[PDB]
């Protein structure tokens, strides 16, 4: 994953200032879901570039998507507004199923997608998709690390949760390790292989809690894997000053890492500010949202083929 061939681009249709703000390959083949800077969820043919559907989902910019593996459900988070996070049905007709009115970030469980885990500040809320019941509430003030950009996440087998840098056993809802706070914002993800935990630049061992790796270039990055968790992608965030002018979450470049030994592969600078990036289900494509600038945002989805 060092070569990246442009395959197609498209901008938001009918909009002088294109407002795509996040993307995710849908379970359907040739199609990408993009949330937009104005609450909307669009459906696009990643190759033709044609817009296929449009759904007003929130009344503020969409920050995060996650389509379900089976094609039937979608999660969305927003920036401000009620609900902060919503779960949508998608089988032949787009309707809301649930809504998590205070979670500013939501994500499906990993093993069987039988639970949504949502984040509110330093708190994690697991819900149940059929009913919407809050099964758990994971937080511990004696252990909280107050990560500015915390996102509670499930592990591959749903056995564990990580939230504010604390490791939780879901069966007993008992925190089983705090990882020392070494940065102000990044809370960590579980490695897809399930053997290690990546918290900002620290790669910890999940079984011994040993430091296995220092990776300075993952400082402040969000991280995304290829489907097979053999390539790692890191885009670095940017920054709190001043009022607002619709500031892109990431800078202008991203990096690829061997997912196994964290040795670097390539640095990819697209000379444009990145809002989001995602990888497909078949390991062929990386799709990136890239601001072109205006008098204040004008983004285009670029679909790259990985090499």
């Amino acid at each position: 994953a060092s070569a990246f061939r442009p395959i197609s681009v498209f901008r938001e249709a009918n909009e002088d200032e294109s407002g795509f703000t996040c993307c995710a390959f849908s379970a359907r083949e040739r199609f990408l879901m993009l949330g937009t800077c104005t609450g909307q969820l669009k459906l696009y043919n990643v190759f033709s570039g044609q817009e296929e559907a449009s759904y007003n989902c929130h009344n503020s910019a969409i920050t995060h998507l996650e389509p379900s593996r089976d094609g039937s459900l979608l999660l969305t988070s927003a920036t401000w507004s009620q609900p902060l996070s919503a779960l949508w049905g998608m089988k032949s007709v787009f309707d809301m199923k649930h809504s998590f009115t205070e979670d500013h970030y939501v994500e499906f469980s990993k093993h069987s997608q039988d639970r949504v885990i949502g984040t509110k500040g330093d708190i994690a809320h697991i819900y149940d998709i059929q009913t919407g019941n809050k099964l758990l509430t994971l937080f511990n003030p004696d252990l909280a690390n107050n990560y500015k950009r915390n996102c509670a996440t499930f592990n591959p087998t749903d056995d564990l949760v990580l939230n504010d840098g604390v490791l939780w056993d879901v069966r007993s809802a008992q925190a089983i390790h705090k990882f020392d706070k070494f940065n102000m914002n990044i809370s960590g993800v579980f490695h897809p292989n399930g053997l290690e935990v990546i918290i900002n630049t620290e790669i910890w061992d999940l079984r011994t809690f040993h430091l296995l790796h220092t990776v300075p270039a993952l400082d402040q990055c969000r991280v995304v894997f290829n489907h097979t968790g053999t390539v790692m992608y890191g885009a670095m965030l940017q920054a709190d000053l001043m009022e607002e002018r619709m500031k892109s979450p990431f800078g202008s470049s991203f990096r690829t890492f061997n997912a196994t030994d964290y040795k670097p592969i390539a640095t990819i600078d697209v000379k444009r500010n990145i809002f989001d990036l995602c990888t497909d289900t078949k390991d062929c494509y990386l799709a990136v949202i890239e601001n072109q600038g205006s008098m204040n945002m004008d983004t285009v989805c670029r679909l790259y083929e990985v090499g």
Binding site: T79, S81, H104, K120, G121, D240, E244
Partner: protein, 304 residues
């Protein structure tokens, strides 16, 4: 660069305590409201004694314009809001329906809807072109200290003495959110940040907090001033540097740095509690008004 607030013009001629000041959406005029039942206009750079408006029987706590700077809505202690033709001062309409004093009033960006908070312990959405009351929101268990509209107009932020800051869905009237500190001190002022993501809010334990109201967390807290008994109207400052400005109950007006909470500048001079301050949309200008022991306005200009 730290500010250089310089006292430019002082405005006298108010019979009693003056409670609220504002600059025009154009910034050529300064509108003030007093416990003397009067609304007055002054020269928004030079401070010139303009027209003076009248018709409210009791005191007036606060005064807001519309987008085109053509109508004020005064909120009076006679349970009344009135919309005024700024050009003539001929009261356009007298909004009616609150049960007790009306203390806070404002419009939405399309200069068509009125939002009022009151001691009747409610908030109200009015129609400016007709004056009818659209909505009665049992906003709080107590008198309602501020009401504000965001840069679009689909949210109402409200203050209350019950420590409850609150956010409202205008098009529906639903209570979108409900801020609470872990404690419950009263909140005496609230407004949106000019970028809409955030909320300034004053409380009466000498506190002034900036909030991100959808994540529900306090992102900064400025202090040092005196705010224990009175509802001082505080402001942002995004003309030069990004500041935070607010009057006080030791007859001063304190300014902190927006993003570092530090006591950047102080401005003394008044004789009583500084109850109101506004900042000119364009220029780096500070207005400030105090209660009956002063009964005057005062203007400060900064190079930044």
């Amino acid at each position: 660069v730290k500010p250089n607030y310089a006292l430019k013009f002082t405005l006298a001629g108010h019979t009693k305590a003056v409670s609220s000041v504002k600059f025009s959406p154009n910034g050529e005029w300064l509108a003030s409201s007093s416990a003397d039942k009067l609304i007055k206009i002054w020269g928004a750079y030079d401070g010139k004694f303009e027209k003076t408006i009248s018709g409210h029987k009791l005191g007036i706590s606060d005064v807001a314009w519309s987008s085109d700077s053509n109508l004020l809505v005064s909120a009076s202690d006679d349970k009344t809001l009135k919309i005024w033709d700024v050009s003539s001062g001929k009261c356009l309409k007298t909004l009616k329906g609150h049960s007790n004093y009306v203390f806070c009033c404002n419009f939405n960006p399309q200069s068509n809807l009125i939002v009022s908070g009151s001691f009747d312990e409610s908030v109200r959405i009015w129609d400016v072109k007709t004056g009818k009351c659209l909505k009665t929101l049992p906003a709080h268990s107590d008198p309602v200290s501020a009401v504000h509209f965001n840069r679009d107009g689909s949210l109402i932020v409200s203050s209350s003495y019950d420590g409850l800051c609150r956010i409202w869905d205008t098009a529906s009237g639903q209570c979108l959110k409900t801020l609470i500190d872990d404690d419950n001190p009263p909140v005496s002022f609230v407004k949106f940040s000019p970028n809409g993501k955030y909320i300034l809010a004053a409380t009466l334990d000498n506190t002034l907090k900036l909030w991100d109201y959808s994540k529900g967390k306090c992102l900064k807290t400025y202090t040092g001033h005196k705010n224990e008994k009175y509802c001082i109207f505080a402001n942002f400052s995004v003309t030069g540097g990004k500041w935070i400005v607010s009057g006080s109950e030791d007859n001063l007006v304190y300014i902190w740095n927006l993003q570092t909470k530090e006591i950047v500048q102080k401005l003394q001079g008044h004789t009583d509690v500084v109850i109101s301050t506004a900042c000119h949309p364009t220029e780096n200008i500070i207005a400030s008004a105090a209660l009956e022991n002063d009964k005057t306005i005062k203007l400060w200009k900064s190079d930044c």
